[PDB]
């Protein structure tokens, strides 16, 4: 159905990146008539995992989602995704800071577009970072590893989690701090954790701070304060993203919106 060919697979020797799971390399897979440039992601609980998270890329289909090409069982386990050659936004913003306002709104407007889907979809993505936006071109975005998403139940509208994991807590809403409970809503927090990574060139949210100081500082209702630069009506949407409250806190539909016709406003003063 999905399983590769390991014979038509070549890998690449240096890693693109890496973490608990193994390693994430460049590849080659010999398609119908084309080579196509793949990403490869290499490893008893990382398979299911592994397995997991290829059952949910298998499912998804929108152009600002990385798409899988297939699983394969060699040297060790292998999911084989599309290649995004620029990589990842954090590390790319950090290493282009000419990069204009209009291309961070039109990037962060296509995961916005890409989330919105994924909320029609009922999946939760729960790692929604600029470190997984990963670009095509300098003008495309595609949301990327799904390690830890979930596709919700037909009777609820989140997932509540067992056990707290090893978890990225500067992106996650209250809700999933306290009740564990992770919605659209919360990917929605997260979006606005990702937007003000954007428009900061990649640089750490609540740097020098360790999770409790984050979790007392949105109790007394704090928030990050608005990036050098950072257009005040996206500053305003970071902040309307950061709701406490998950009922009051807008959806991707709502976020969507105001991002292409904020987007379609600087598009139209450019040409001014
Ligand atoms: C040029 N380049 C492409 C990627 C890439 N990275 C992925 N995961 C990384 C895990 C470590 C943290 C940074 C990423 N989140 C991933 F899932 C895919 C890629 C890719 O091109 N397609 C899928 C990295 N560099």
Redesign the pocket.
Not at 16 to 19: A, E, K, Q, R, T
Not at 81 to 88: H, I, R, S, V
């Given at each position: 159905e999905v399983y590769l060919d390991r014979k038509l697979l070549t890998l690449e020797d240096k890693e693109?990146?890496?973490?608990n799971f193994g390693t994430?390399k460049?590849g080659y897979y010999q398609m119908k008539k084309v080579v196509k440039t793949?990403?490869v992601?290499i490893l008893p609980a990382l398979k299911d995992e592994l397995l997991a998270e290829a059952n949910v890329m298998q499912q998804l289909d929108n152009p600002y989602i990385?798409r899988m090409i297939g699983i394969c069982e060699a040297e060790s386990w292998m999911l084989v995704?599309?290649?995004?050659?620029?990589?990842?936004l954090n590390?790319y913003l950090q290493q282009n800071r000419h990069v204009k306002d209009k291309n961070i709104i039109e990037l962060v407007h296509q995961v916005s577009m890409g989330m919105k889907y994924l909320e029609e979809s009922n999946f939760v993505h729960r790692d929604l970072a600029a470190?997984?936006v990963?670009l095509v071109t300098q003008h495309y975005a595609?949301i990327?590893?799904f390690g830890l998403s979930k596709a919700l139940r037909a009777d609820e509208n989140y997932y509540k989690a067992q056990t707290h994991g090893k978890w990225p807590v500067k992106w996650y809403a209250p809700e999933c701090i306290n009740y564990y409970k992770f919605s659209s809503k919360s990917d929605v927090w997260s979006f606005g954790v990702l937007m003000w990574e954007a428009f900061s060139y990649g640089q750490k949210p609540y740097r020098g701070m360790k999770g409790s100081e984050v979790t007392a500082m949105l109790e007394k209702g704090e928030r990050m304060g608005c990036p050098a630069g950072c257009p005040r009506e996206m500053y305003d949407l970071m902040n309307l993203c950061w709701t406490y409250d998950v009922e009051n806190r807008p959806g991707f539909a709502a976020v969507e919106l105001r991002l292409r016709n904020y987007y379609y406003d600087v598009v139209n003063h450019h040409h001014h």
């Open positions: 693109l990146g890496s973490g994430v460049k793949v990403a992601k990385v995704m599309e290649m995004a050659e620029l990589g990842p590390k470190r997984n990963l595609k990327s590893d």
